[PDB]
């Protein structure tokens, strides 16, 4: 996270690390003791045994508990437009919730759409400046100001990138806050009123000065609940 500050896992006990064998780090969020949600770009086409979930720690890779993935659920991820950029990971063993450092985050109401000028709380271990691709050892947090979807699309259209902006995402941060999703921050939870309203995307082709992009969880709540009910085949 660029332009945030050092946090603590007790401030965002839903946040987890998603370690992917020989691939980029991502963040994630606890939905239930058995399910974690992250970005699709993190785990698309990756075997579950190559994926670890790191929970209950402020640190990126150490001092918590690690649990292997069992199944990966992807629902029509389109890497070209980054449409439907979410994945649900089922753990091999249950996550030990403790209402201190490890807690589930509630899903939002159907089609929830954060209002422009409101703020979402985002937390993760991605890069903390735009020159470095190195991850943060410490959990960082920031409030990202929500940018109107149309206005964000118009901005992205300037560099012909408007294809990344659609109803299934919302935009937050950017020049107004000087606050951005960094490399490694894909999958980071975005929280509003004690519910998970967004899941961070990372668009490698995008420079700074544009708002960051977040999966609109509301748009996909039926899909998330279908996955959790066992009504969706794993990858």
Which residues of this chain interact with Zn ion, rule CB under 5 A?
A: 76, 167, 223
Which long-range contacts does 224-229 make (Cβ < 8 Å, 24+ apart)? 224/31, 224/37, 224/86, 224/88, 224/107, 225/107, 227/35, 227/73, 227/75, 227/88, 228/31, 228/32, 228/35, 228/88
Q: In this complex, which beta carbon is closest to Zn ion, that of residue 130 or of residue 183?
A: 130
CB of 150 to Zn ion, least distance (A): 6
153 is in an annotated binding site: yes
Distance of alpha carbon 155 from the chain centroid:
22
Q: In this complex, which beta carbon is closest to Zn ion, that of residue 67 or of residue 152?
A: 152
Helix (H, G, I), strand (E, B) or coil at 83: strand
Residue of minimal CB distance from Zn ion?
Answer: 76
Q: In this complex, which beta carbon is closest to Zn ion, that of residue 9 or of residue 142?
A: 142
DSSP string for residues in 149-174: HHHHHHHHHTTT-GGG-STTEEEE-B
Helix (H, G, I), strand (E, B) or coil at 116: coil
Which two three-digit tokens encode residue 119? 């703020």
What is the Cα gyration radius of the chain? 16
CA distances from 96 to 36, 37, 101, 221 (A): 13, 16, 10, 24
Distance of alpha carbon 136 from the chain centroid:
16
Q: In this complex, which beta carbon is closest to Zn ion, that of residue 54 or of residue 216?
A: 216
Q: In this complex, which beta carbon is closest to Zn ion, that of residue 11 or of residue 157?
A: 157
Per the annotation, where are the binding residues for Zn(2+)? 153
């Amino acid at each position: 996270i660029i332009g945030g500050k050092k946090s603590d896992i007790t401030k965002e006990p839903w946040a987890v690390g998603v370690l992917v064998d020989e691939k980029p780090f991502c963040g994630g969020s606890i939905l239930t003791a058995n399910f974690v949600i992250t970005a699709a770009q993190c785990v698309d086409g990756t075997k579950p045994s190559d994926i670890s979930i790191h929970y209950g720690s402020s640190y990126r890779t150490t001092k918590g508990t690690s649990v292997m993935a069992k199944k990966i659920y992807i629902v029509r991820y389109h890497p070209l437009t980054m449409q439907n950029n979410y994945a649900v990971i089922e753990t091999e063993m249950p996550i030990k919730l403790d209402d201190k450092t490890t807690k589930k985050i509630e899903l939002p109401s159907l089609l929830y759409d954060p209002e422009p000028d409101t703020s979402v709380l985002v937390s993760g271990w991605g890069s903390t400046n735009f020159k470095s691709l190195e991850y943060s050892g410490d959990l960082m947090e920031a409030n990202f100001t929500v940018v109107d979807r149309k206005s964000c699309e118009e901005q992205y259209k300037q560099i012909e990138a408007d294809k990344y902006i659609y109803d299934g995402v919302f935009c937050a941060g950017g020049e107004y806050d000087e606050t951005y999703i960094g490399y490694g921050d894909a999958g980071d939870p975005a929280v509003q009123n004690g519910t998970l309203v967004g899941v961070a995307s990372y668009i490698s082709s995008m420079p700074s000065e544009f708002p960051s992009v977040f999966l609109r969880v509301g748009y996909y709540v039926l899909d998330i609940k279908d996955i959790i009910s066992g009504k969706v085949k794993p990858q």
